Design an enzyme around this catalytic site. Structure first.
Site, PDB file in Angstrom:
ATOM      1  CG  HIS A 115      -0.821  -1.945  -5.609  1.00  0.00           C
ATOM      2  ND1 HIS A 115      -2.109  -1.081  -5.289  1.00  0.00           N
ATOM      3  CD2 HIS A 115      -1.148  -2.910  -4.741  1.00  0.00           C
ATOM      4  CE1 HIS A 115      -3.023  -1.780  -4.731  1.00  0.00           C
ATOM      5  NE2 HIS A 115      -2.209  -3.216  -4.445  1.00  0.00           N
ATOM      6  CE  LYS A 171      -3.875  -3.160   0.307  1.00  0.00           C
ATOM      7  NZ  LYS A 171      -3.969  -4.449  -0.711  1.00  0.00           N
ATOM      8  CG  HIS A 189      -8.660  -1.051  -8.436  1.00  0.00           C
ATOM      9  ND1 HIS A 189      -8.979  -2.127  -9.091  1.00  0.00           N
ATOM     10  CD2 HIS A 189      -8.877  -1.246  -7.101  1.00  0.00           C
ATOM     11  CE1 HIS A 189      -9.433  -3.152  -8.465  1.00  0.00           C
ATOM     12  NE2 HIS A 189      -9.288  -2.515  -7.184  1.00  0.00           N
TER      13      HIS A 189
END
Lengths: 460, 123, 460, 123
Positions: free
Chosen positions: D13, D40, D114
């Site tokens: 990310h 993904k 996350h």
């Protein structure tokens, strides 16, 4: 991200100079194959040391090198390291013996990444296998594919093998062809498979002393193992009785067997009939080898009728040496013009003569015909059929490979073929012409072809 | 290569010192010679010295027949490798048959360029 | 005999140091792939040098590198030796402009061995493609597969392309996806195809501006090219009308299309019905992509009914984002419990919910079920469905890959899956769990499982 | 201290200098980051300073919330890559979507481990 390197050397001895340059590659390739390279216990140390610092090794193949029990012990020591991720290992024909199975047993126990092992062509004997089964039974062993052809095994080896099978549910392939396990051993092995919870996908028992009785045994494995995709039983005196005994399981609705090898099993037109009940009822069966059985034109007849009916979706049919004569060609011609599933047909070593071949050519030359590979080696073909073959090669658009080896074809017949194949509209990619005599000129034209049309390989 | 057509012949049919005349030798020599992709159905290897073979392409050890086909005068140590399996695709399995017989070859420029494999089918 | 070596480096800055170490390999590898390795026009001279003394070279892939018309001119020169037998070349995303298509046009006529060329992602323009086709038309050019996605081509390029098609009888694959050639271009192209004698095997026109109108032209191509195996038309506004116009060509008895990609083509339950007729009639169609079409549970019902009808032997069905809800799952559950041919099902991005998913699991747990790959990403699944899923992972034995990404499966849910997947009786090989949160405790748990059962890969 | 979970996060990310922010960029950065086998479905990249991302986890750049779910107090330059294709198998085609938004992450030991991808599903 990625750095994948592969080394694959075959049938060529290196020499210390070449061997020196190759060594550092051994430290970085994920796949390493040194097949028949004159490797000696001496270079096994280099291998071992280089393999120790190889973080990527996924496949190691050292087939056909005289490594011996000690040479193998040496290489395997380069693998017992907390960084080794080897998945496939082949030590086929490496002069390994029963005494070498100890090292193998330890390795197996300490390498949970290894899923496939090839040990064929090594005199391990029952003693060796027994030792091997000790590591196989280890809960740390995750092996799923094992090949043990020509390993000097007897029915004695079947109990330990059956015990491994009964205990490893993720076992996928067991190949034990060319070992004389006979009826006693085969039956035991079968008991192990039925009781075993393994989703076996391939079982090969070729030239193993399998009998008709064993067929009731096998019928059970087939009927229950829904994961079974390949069953090789060639070179076993099964007979028409074994055939009949086996068929009921193949028809079982849960069976999705895709490949069935029953060449030289002593089957005649009678068992062929039993077999046909299966072919017309199972669309899952794609490959069938019936080579070496005296089926006759009566057998070809039955086959061809089935190949023209719905339900039969067989893609490859190998019927080399089945006692076919020119008479069955009219039926084969119909399958080739009509059938849209059959892509490979091997009818070599059948006396079809120029008559039968002209007709095969009729069906093949039709529109929509899909055959991709046709083997007509040693079929009694003369310069006479070469005109029909020449035209078919242009009429038909599906063929990509043609084998006409060992036919008394001549300079005359060859020319005709060179004529069509030269065409850009002929899309054939391989033509096999072994053991056929032709002059220096024809020879010349052939090398012309190879240079003008590089997309087509002319074999010998 | 010595006269390509003749060299092609030597590659496919000549093994001076066999060092094995069994199934194992066949499986091995077929691969080393490149007659395995696809599997060559039948191949016969002649053993001994080359001069003996050359001679056939003359009348010292050779003798005419048909299409420049000479059936040698002397007998040769040979090994015929025959495909024994279910499919035409590799891996190729060979059964070896050893023999001491005369060979039939086709001669071109006084050199053998073709071995008639038929006589080796059934003995 | 053989010495095969390959090098595949992807997304790695090399460095002058490592670069020097790899050069000698470029001289002996039969395959060289240097994908996104930051190759400059300087390293291109090094590449050309090693390449020209490499007789082995069969494939060169220099994808994603700032080469330019200069660096590509350099590399191409190395393939100028009469010893060159290159067969596959990819210069995808290499900064090649139209000015550089001149050298390419030039080399194409001198490389009769070259059969596949990838030029995707270069701004070639209609100007460049014009020059290129001049070489392609050269009888010495033996190209069979050409890829031109994202090449800034317009309808202007279709005439020249039609000319090459009309001329080369062994052309096998043409990909012009992602080029605004629009209706007109697509029309010209279909003309050149309808009369070319080539046995086209694959045609890809995704995001090309294909209209429901072009669907009549395509219907002709499909109806007449028996060699056509793959047709890609995704991302084009064809609609239920286009679909109705295309189906008649698909129903042709000569058509043996295997793969049909019609994702995001504006189809609904209505067009889906027409399509279903084709499905129950052609067992040759194995792959179908319907992703992104608002089919709804109504389209899902039609599909499932056909999938249970004999005759439809579809193997892969991608129906992601098709507006399905839990209501369709009783049906898909039936197919999974009964259908013996479907091995791949993608129902991702549909609100199946815990209820829909618990229904799918029932059919999947049936004895004899065959599914191998199941995609359930973003389907509104939670810890509730996980006990059901965990049980099916042990009850069913065919599954090999499962994707549950973007589902709010919690530590509680993941735990349940880990218990199952840990068992040796679970043959699953791949578990995709993207964008799902779990604690460090579970992270460790998964890492432990990773080291224990190496055969199974947990993606992220 | 950058470690594993946090590191995994940054890998999937975090892209400091966007060096482009369209399809081309997405298709490329995705392969580069190993989020391509298999494809993904959706993936958002946060641009900018690494340390301002780290701050979010301990009332610095993001107010403390639940499961240690926390939203960032400030907006970040972000690019979201979305799977545009007809199959779940590579090659993966992506449609890029740039924006300037607050991001919601899960924190562990004061580190973001996350990223909540669901808020990025709709522009």
């Amino acid at each position: 991200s990625l750095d994948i390197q592969s080394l694959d050397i075959q049938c060529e001895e290196l020499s210390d100079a070449r061997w020196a340059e190759l060594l550092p590659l051994l430290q970085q390739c994920q796949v390493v194959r040194l097949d028949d390279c004159g490797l000696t216990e001496a270079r096994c140390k280099d291998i071992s040391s280089a393999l120790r610092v190889n973080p990527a090794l996924a496949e190691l193949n050292l087939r056909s090198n005289e490594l011996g029990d000690v040479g193998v012990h040496c290489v395997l020591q380069g693998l017992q390291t907390p960084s080794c991720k080897i998945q496939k290992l082949s030590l086929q024909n490496c002069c390994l013996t029963g005494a070498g199975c100890g090292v193998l047993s330890s390795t197996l126990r300490t390498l949970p990444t290894l899923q496939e092992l090839h040990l064929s062509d090594n005199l391990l004997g029952d003693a060796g296998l027994q030792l091997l089964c000790e590591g196989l039974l280890d809960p740390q062993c995750r092996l799923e594919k094992l090949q043990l052809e020509y390993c000097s095994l007897s029915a004695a080896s079947c109990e330990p093998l059956a015990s491994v099978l009964r205990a490893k549910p993720d076992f996928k392939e067991l190949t034990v062809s060319n070992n004389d396990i006979n009826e006693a051993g085969v039956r035991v092995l079968c008991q192990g498979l039925k009781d075993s919870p393994c989703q076996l996908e391939a079982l090969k028992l070729e030239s193993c002393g399998v009998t008709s009785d064993n067929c009731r045994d096998l019928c059970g494995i087939v009927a229950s193992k829904a994961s079974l995709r390949e069953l090789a039983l060639g070179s076993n005196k099964l007979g028409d009785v074994g055939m009949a005994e086996l068929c009921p399981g193949l028809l079982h609705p849960s069976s999705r067997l895709r490949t069935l090898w029953i060449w030289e099993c002593g089957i005649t037109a009678k068992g062929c009939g039993d077999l046909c009940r299966v072919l017309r009822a199972k669309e899952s069966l794609k490959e069938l080898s019936l080579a070496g059985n005296e089926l006759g034109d009566e057998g070809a007849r039955l086959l061809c009728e089935t190949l023209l009916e719905p339900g039969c979706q067989l893609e490859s049919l190998w019927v080399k040496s089945c006692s076919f004569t020119a008479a069955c060609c009219s039926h084969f011609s119909s399958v080739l013009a009509q059938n849209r599933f059959l892509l490979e047909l091997q009818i070599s070593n059948n006396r079809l003569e120029d008559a039968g071949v002209r007709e095969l050519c009729q069906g093949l030359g039709q529109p929509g015909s899909v055959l991709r590979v046709l083997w007509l080696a040693d079929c009694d073909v003369s310069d006479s059929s070469c005109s029909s073959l020449a035209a078919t090669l242009l009429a038909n658009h599906s063929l990509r490979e043609l084998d006409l080896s060992n036919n008394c074809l001549g300079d005359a017949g060859i020319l005709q073929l060179v004529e069509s194949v030269r065409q850009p509209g002929c899309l054939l990619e391989q033509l096999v012409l072994y053991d056929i005599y032709w002059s220096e000129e024809m020879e010349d034209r052939l090398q012309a072809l190879e240079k003008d049309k590089p997309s087509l390989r002319v074999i010998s | 290569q010595d006269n390509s057509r003749y060299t092609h012949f030597l590659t496919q049919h000549y093994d001076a010192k066999p060092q094995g005349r069994d199934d194992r030798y066949c499986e091995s020599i077929m691969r080393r010679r490149g007659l395995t992709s696809p599997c060559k159905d039948i191949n016969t290897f002649i053993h001994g010295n080359k001069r003996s073979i050359k001679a056939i392409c003359e009348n010292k050890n050779g003798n005419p027949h048909r299409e420049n086909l000479r059936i040698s005068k002397s007998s040769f140590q040979v090994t015929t490798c025959k495909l024994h399996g279910g499919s035409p695709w590799p891996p190729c399995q060979y059964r070896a048959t050893a023999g001491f017989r005369n060979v039939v070859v086709a001669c071109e420029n006084g050199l053998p360029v073709h071995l008639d494999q038929s006589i080796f089918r059934r003995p």
